[PDB]
């Protein structure tokens, strides 16, 4: 199976209430393994998975210095961006950064990325070739030309094609029992009366890992997203995921409606109609 | 492992 390692950074300014809130989180696939929160006790990068606690004291020291260096860039960035957009000091603003890398089932590098947002929309991102930047607006053209002059892409490419894939590989084998598992979805089927004219068929999927799942509704081979209420995939809280899809059916004609579940833990994509 | 060289916007 393919794998990824991703880091997520959110920084939010606090006018008149001091230093920005800084939160960093690291994932391997859909398993969070590290966090730092500027508001927590320790002021250290903290373990969030059993298999990462077997790293030594130098790992945690190092991560703590590097996350605190991210904390700094983000903080100065909030002031810098305020300047670029000429915004007042009385407002709260958000920066978010996401970077990481994908590997294939051979565990070789597939893709690397580094995205950056201001106020919840795209500011600047490293393009697919890891050599160039896409600036969103005129103010981000400044950051881009600054990052071209400072050779930022080169250092990122070296991380994303090298260190990122090297450490992902290490994590995947350190947490083999947790990371390289695939949990098959346990599927249900429920039916409830809206009235005496309408009936809701709801297709369930529980206890799956990884989170990537497709639930689709269909009548006689032709797919039906004209009625498909589809909820967002939600964490169960034990490291597995849940999701459901509903359609509103003319009751009595529930024969020719089929729910299709596809997941990587399924040997064959499941087909299901109401019992 | 985090990236070691972050740079200001």
């Amino acid at each position: 199976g393919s794998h990824s390692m991703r880091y997520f950074f959110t920084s939010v300014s606090r006018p008149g209430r001091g230093e920005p809130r800084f939160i960093a989180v690291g994932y391997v696939d859909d398993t969070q393994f590290v966090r730092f929160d500027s508001d927590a006790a320790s002021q250290r990068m903290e373990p969030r998975a059993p298999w990462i606690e077997q790293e030594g004291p130098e790992y945690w020291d190092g991560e703590t210095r590097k996350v605190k260096a991210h904390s700094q860039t983000h903080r100065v960035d909030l002031g810098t961006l305020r300047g670029y957009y000429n915004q007042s000091e009385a407002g709260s603003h958000t920066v978010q950064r996401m970077y990481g890398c994908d590997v294939g089932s051979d565990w070789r590098f597939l893709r690397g990325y580094h995205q950056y947002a201001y106020d919840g929309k795209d500011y600047i991102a490293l393009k697919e070739d890891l050599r160039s930047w896409t600036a969103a607006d005129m103010a981000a053209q400044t950051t881009k030309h600054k990052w071209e002059a400072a050779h930022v892409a080169e250092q990122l490419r070296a991380y994303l094609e090298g260190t990122c894939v090297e450490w992902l590989r290490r994590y995947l084998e350190n947490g083999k029992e947790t990371l390289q598992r695939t949990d098959a979805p346990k599927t249900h089927m429920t039916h409830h009366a809206v009235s005496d004219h309408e009936a809701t068929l709801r297709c369930w999927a529980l206890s799956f890992y990884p989170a990537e799942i497709t639930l689709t509704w269909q009548r006689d081979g032709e797919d039906q997203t004209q009625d498909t209420e589809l909820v967002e995939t939600r964490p169960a809280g034990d490291g597995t995921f849940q999701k459901w899809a509903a359609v509103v059916v003319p009751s009595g004609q529930e024969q020719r409606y089929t729910c299709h579940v596809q997941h990587e833990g399924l040997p064959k994509p499941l087909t299901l109609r109401w019992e | 492992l985090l990236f070691g060289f972050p740079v200001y916007v």
Epitope: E58, Y59, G62, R65, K66, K68, A69, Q72, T73, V76, A149, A150, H151, E154, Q155, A158, Y159, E161, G162, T163 | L1, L2, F3, G4, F5, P6, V7, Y8
Partner: T-cell receptor, first 110, second 116 residues
Amino acid sequence: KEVEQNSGPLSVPEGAIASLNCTYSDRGSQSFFWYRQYSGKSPELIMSIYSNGDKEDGRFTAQLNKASQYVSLLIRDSQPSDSATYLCAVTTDSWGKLQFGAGTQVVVTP
Amino acid sequence: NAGVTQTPKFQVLKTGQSMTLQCAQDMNHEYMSWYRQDPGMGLRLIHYSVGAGITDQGEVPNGYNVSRSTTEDFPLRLLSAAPSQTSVYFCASRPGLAGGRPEQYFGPGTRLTVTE
């Protein structure tokens, strides 16, 4: 010793290859350097390498093997002006101490 | 861009004299360092600084102090010279979060000899 460098002195005639090795101990090191320091002078950066594999720049070739934690420098076609102490330097990040090896002195003989 | 300048190149101090070594940098680097170099010891970090106005000790701070009033300038003070301070002191600078390729560049050095 975070960084371990060979010997000294390394005697090589002109035209020959001087191969310098170094070992580091922090697994999370991301940046790798070679400095040249002439006697009575200051260390001068000659090679920087950031990914596994080779990097050529004139007569200099720097190799990096992160899996064995090994940095190397090849000096081909040695000139008498290559006679100096060569220091490898290793870091983890922009706030991490640059970790220097002790140096290996290279003597180029006529 | 001069890069890392440093003065004096040479200095005889007499035990118990104060002196300051100057160091200046052209590159808007955040991260400046002081070292000494000694025959059996290699390069040894004395004090360092990752921004203007802030500093911290290295492995060998004792008998030295340091300030960073501006980003450009990083003077080292020896407040009372001892004969173990005879050494070759090097200022250095890397970008920190400010900049480019993460390369550290060194001043030309200062050869200080302390005698009784």
